[PDB]
Amino acid sequence: AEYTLRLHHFFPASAPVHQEYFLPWKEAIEKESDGRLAVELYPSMQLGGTPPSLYDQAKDGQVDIIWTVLGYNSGRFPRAEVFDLPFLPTSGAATSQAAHEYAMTHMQDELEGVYPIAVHTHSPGALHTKETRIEALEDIEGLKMRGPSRLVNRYLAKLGAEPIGMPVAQALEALSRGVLDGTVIPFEAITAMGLADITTEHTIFSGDRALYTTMMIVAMDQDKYDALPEDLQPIIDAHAGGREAYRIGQIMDQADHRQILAIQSGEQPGTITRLGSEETARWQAVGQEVVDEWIAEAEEKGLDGQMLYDDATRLVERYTRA
């Protein structure tokens, strides 16, 4: 063992991405380097600091690898915010593929200082509340709701909710404390994060697109990568890129399915409310306003909003059809 790679994230060890991606990734790097690389996993922010501080922990070499949400740093990753727009995503797997290709095309300057192992998204975002069953747009009116990013929080406000921004690792405390009525998140880690018995009302939508997702990165310090010897850099490259994005997305999709099945079957308490095509169209109409406003503001910013939105949408459809 010549080099140690400390990987730091904010999820519990029992989270599916830890059990089914990071542990086998560790196994692969340690086997394929013939023990010359060790990977050490640190869940639950166990090397210190705040979820939003994680990106800089890697970029600045306090740790070697982080897993984080780009939207936790408001304004930092403007081109990545395209993947926060309403009804843009499909599956974790397909949208993660689209995110990685999109980021390799458009986000080279945005990600300078990290080697991206995977640029991906989570599985379909859904609405979770403590008490209020969301059966219509009217039911979310005045609910204190948490989203991952300023653009998802903007959609929540437009839908008539009162968004309160914070990292998801802060939601359990805030719900129990009465700050939040609910949160948007995928189902995949809802059991590992212990939210399932607190937010027991869940709402999902009709049709071939999800309410929202958000862009996530497995990012290694560009200095740690660059400092590896020429025969070990390729062990990382062989366990990096679009195929890793797909793999993370697919693990989330699979964990979502197990979790949704467990609620539908009565094995775990809670209700899944499926909004039909007519009700869903009302949410998509609000969503269209967010898309239009974001493209407009991107133009005054000096970003080509329409071009990034068209390439993101094109890539989602391509990887969904495939």
Ligand X SMILES: COc1cc(/C=C/C(=O)O)ccc1O
Determine if 226 is a binding residue for Mg ion (CB under 5 A): no
Look at residue 86 and give the partner it binds from ligand X, Mg ion, none, a contact being a CB closer than 5 to 8 Å depending on partner kind.
none
Look at residue 122 and give the partner it binds from ligand X, Mg ion, none, a contact being a CB closer than 5 to 8 Å depending on partner kind.
ligand X
DSSP 233-262: HHHHHTT-SHHHHHHHHHHHHHHHHHHHHH
| Rounded Cα gap, residues 256 and 89, in angstroms | 15
Residue with tokens 């609405």: 127
Q: Which of 54, 111, 126, 189 binds ligand X (CB under 6 A)?
A: 189
Residue with tokens 């990034």: 308
Residue of 142, 124, 122, 123 lying closest to 132 (CA atoms): 142
Tell whether 197 is in a known binding site.
no
Determine if 142 is a binding residue for Mg ion (CB under 5 A): no
Tell whether 59 is in a known binding site.
yes
Number of CB atoms found within 10 A of residue 318's CB: 13
Determine if 164 is a binding residue for ligand X (CB under 6 A): no
| Binding range to ligand X, per CB under 6 A, among 37-45, 74-82, 181-189, 276-284 | 181-189
Determine if 64 is a binding residue for Mg ion (CB under 5 A): no
Taking CB atoms, the residue at the shortest distance from ligand X is 189
| Rounded Cα gap, residues 114 and 55, in angstroms | 9
Least gap, CB of 29 to Mg ion (angstroms): 19
Are 285 and 159 spatial neighbours (Cβ–Cβ below 8 Å)? Answer: no
Least gap, CB of 53 to ligand X (angstroms): 14
Q: Which of 9, 79, 120, 122 binds ligand X (CB under 6 A)?
A: 122
Determine if 223 is a binding residue for Mg ion (CB under 5 A): yes
In the chain, DSSP assigns E strands to: 3-8, 37-42, 65-69, 114-121, 126-129, 144-146, 162-163, 182-185, 201-205, 215-221, 271-275
User: In this structure, which amino acid lies at residue 166?
Assistant: M
Are 106 and 76 spatial neighbours (Cβ–Cβ below 8 Å)? Answer: no
Are 216 and 11 spatial neighbours (Cβ–Cβ below 8 Å)? Answer: no
Determine if 93 is a binding residue for ligand X (CB under 6 A): no
Look at residue 148 and give the partner it binds from ligand X, Mg ion, none, a contact being a CB closer than 5 to 8 Å depending on partner kind.
ligand X
Tell whether 64 is in a known binding site.
no
| Binding range to Mg ion, per CB under 5 A, among 34-42, 203-211, 214-222, 270-278 | 214-222
Residue of 84, 90, 82, 123 lying closest to 209 (CA atoms): 90
Least gap, CB of 33 to ligand X (angstroms): 29
User: In this structure, which amino acid lies at residue 111?
Assistant: L
And the tokens for 300? 């005054």
Least gap, CB of 60 to Mg ion (angstroms): 6
Give the max Cα distance, the chain.
60
Determine if 186 is a binding residue for ligand X (CB under 6 A): yes
Determine if 24 is a binding residue for Mg ion (CB under 5 A): no
Interaction site with ligand X (CB under 6 A) = 69, 122, 148, 167-168, 185-186, 188-189, 193
Please enumerate, by residue number, every residue annotated as part of a binding site.
59, 221, 223
Interaction site with Mg ion (CB under 5 A) = 61, 221, 223
Please enumerate, by residue number, every residue annotated as part of a binding site for Mg(2+).
59, 221, 223
